[PDB]
Amino acid sequence: GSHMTPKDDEFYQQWQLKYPKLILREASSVSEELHKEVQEAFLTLHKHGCLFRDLVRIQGKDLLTPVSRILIGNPGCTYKYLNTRLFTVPWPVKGEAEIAAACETFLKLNDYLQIETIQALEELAAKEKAQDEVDIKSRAAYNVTLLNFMDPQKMPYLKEEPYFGMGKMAVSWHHDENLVDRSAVAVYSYSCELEGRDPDIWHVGFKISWDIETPGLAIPLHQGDCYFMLDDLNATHQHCVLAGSQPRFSSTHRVAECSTGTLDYILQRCQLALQNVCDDVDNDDVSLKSFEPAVLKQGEEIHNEVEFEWLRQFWFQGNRYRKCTDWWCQPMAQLEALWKKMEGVTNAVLHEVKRLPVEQRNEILTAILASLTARQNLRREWHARCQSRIARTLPADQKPECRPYWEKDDASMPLPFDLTDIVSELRGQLLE
Numbered sequence: 264g265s266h267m268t269p270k271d272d273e274f275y276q277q278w279q280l281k282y283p284k285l286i287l288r289e290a291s292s293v294s295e296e297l298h299k300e301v302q303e304a305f306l307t308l309h310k311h312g313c314l315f316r317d318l319v320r321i322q323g324k325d326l327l328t329p330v331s332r333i334l335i336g337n338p339g340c341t342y343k344y345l346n347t348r349l350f351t352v353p354w355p356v357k358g359e360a361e362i363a364a365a366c367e368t369f370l371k372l373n374d375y376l377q378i379e380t381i382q383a384l385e386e387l388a389a390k391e392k393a394q395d396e397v398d399i400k401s402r403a404a405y406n407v408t409l410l411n412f413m414d415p416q417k418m419p420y421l422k423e424e425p426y427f428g429m430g431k432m433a434v435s436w437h438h439d440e441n442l443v444d445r446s447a448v449a450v451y452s453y454s455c456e457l458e459g460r461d462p463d464i465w466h467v468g469f470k471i472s473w474d475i476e477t478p479g480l481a482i483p484l485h486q487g488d489c490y491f492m493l494d495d496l497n498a499t500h501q502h503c504v505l506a507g508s509q510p511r512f513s514s515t516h517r518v519a520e521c522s523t524g525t526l527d528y529i530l531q532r533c534q535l536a537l538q539n540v541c542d543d544v545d546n547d548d549v550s551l552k553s554f555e556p557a558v559l560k561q562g563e564e565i566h567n568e569v570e571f572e573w574l575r576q577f578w579f580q581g582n583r584y585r586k587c588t589d590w591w592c593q594p595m596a597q598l599e600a601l602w603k604k605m606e607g608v609t610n611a612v613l614h615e616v617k618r619l620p621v622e623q624r625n626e627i628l629t630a631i632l633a634s635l636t637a638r639q640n641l642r643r644e645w646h647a648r649c650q651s652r653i654a655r656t657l658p659a660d661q662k663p664e665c666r667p668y669w670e671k672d673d674a675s676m677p678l679p680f681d682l683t684d685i686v687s688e689l690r691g692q693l694l695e
């Protein structure tokens with residue numbers, strides 16, 4: 264099973280006892296200035312068509328998200344879920360103009376929600392009482408917001424909530440991934456809008472992980488209400504979104520764990536790899552400074568990282584971002600040139616092996632074979648993922664592109680797309 268709403272007497276007390284880490288600040292606590300600005304920005308972004316269903320992966324299947332979405336946040340920052348790296352439409356941190364102003368708005372919302380979170384965490388530590396301020400400020404330092412939209416009347420059939428009779432679901436039970444440990448989440452909910460929950464009203468539901476005996480909580484969400492998941496709530500509880508009648512937007516502010524997920528990070532990875540390359544001039548004659556297994560391993564790993572975590576993730580989104588911003592165009596051109604050089608590196612390593620003394624040759628194979636086989640496997644999986652039935656139905660605005668890709672002819676490129684043959688020979692040689 265069952266569930267509790269504010270209609271139930273036990274709700275208040277389940278909340279007080281067992282969800283102290285969940286906070287609700289109702290629309291009343293937020294200036295009607297913000298509301299109009301935030302809500303106008305949602306409706307702007309929608310009109311311009313900045314929100315897209317993402318083509319994700321779940322249990323090995325290609326699925327559009329029920330929800331349309333866009334990521335806004337720090338420049339150069341990314342947020343990865345369900346094996347999809349979302350790139351940030353930049354907000355004006357220190358350091359179009361319609362779209363740009365919405366980004367400014369959601370930044371403004373971000374500052375607001377941050378201050379509320381710090382307060383609530385402060386009050387939460389004070390209750391626990393009956394280093395600390397460092398942790399707290401880091402756990403509220405939102406760097407992105409993932410905006411969301413669903414019009415439920417455009418969906419033919421919505422999933423029933425399976426455990427507690429909560430009715431129709433917009434988003435099923437999950438945790439938010441790729442967040443800093445014990446980091447908070449703050450949500451601004453914008454509804455365009457009795458046995459159990461009102462089906463016409465949107466709700467956020469919560470349950471304890473693993474547990475469908477403890478009745479779940481369904482929190483009504485009216486226009487401009489905010490909720491906060493504090494501390495370890497996101498990890499120890501699941502949440503879902505229960506649809507109502509009308510369309511509904513939301514802004515989900517998060518502290519993305521972006522240690523391997525910023526532009527600066529991956530640029531620096533590329534420069535590390537190219538330290539092994541004689542860099543007098545950019546030509547097709549790539550010569551490497553060392554052939555020590557560990558620097559070659561490292562090089563071929565970085566190559567994989569720029570190729571799959573960045574290039575193919577980016578182009579798989581058919582430059583959807585390009586409608587909103589141009590910010591990533593040059594960086595994705597620079598990463599591609601950096602990756603091209605690396606194809607040059609891999610060719611030079613293959614030249615060196617096919618020249619050594621076997622023992623030296625075999626240390627090299629051993630260092631690189633895992634990276635080359637992953638490269639082959641992930642290229643197949645990405646190529647396919649760009650071909651899927653569902654992918655081919657998207658509009659041209661959003662068609663997956665399989666960049667980088669080249670034909671077996673293309674003599675601009677020194678190695679083939681398909682590495683099967685190359686990988687075969689290398690394994691063979693190791694077994695000599």
Ligand SMILES: CCc1cc(C(=O)NCCNC(=O)/C=C/C(=O)O)cc(Cl)c1Nc1ccccc1C(=O)O
Pocket residue numbers: 319320321322326327328329330344345422433434435436437438439440
């Ligand atoms: C499963 C529900 C869901 C989860 C999340 C999410 O970010 N989760 C991060 C961790 N991973 C998991 O939750 C699960 C992984 C797995 O089972 O492989 C985000 C969305 Cl938007 C979403 N919703 C849907 C996505 C596509 C298709 C239908 C849905 C739906 O909700 O029915």
Ligand SMILES: O=C(O)CNC(=O)C(=O)O
Pocket residue numbers: 409411434439450467504513514515
């Ligand atoms: O904001 C909401 O409650 C709906 N969206 C999400 O929960 C999400 O994006 O994971």
Ligand SMILES: [Fe+3]
Pocket residue numbers: 438439502
């Ligand atoms: Fe969520």
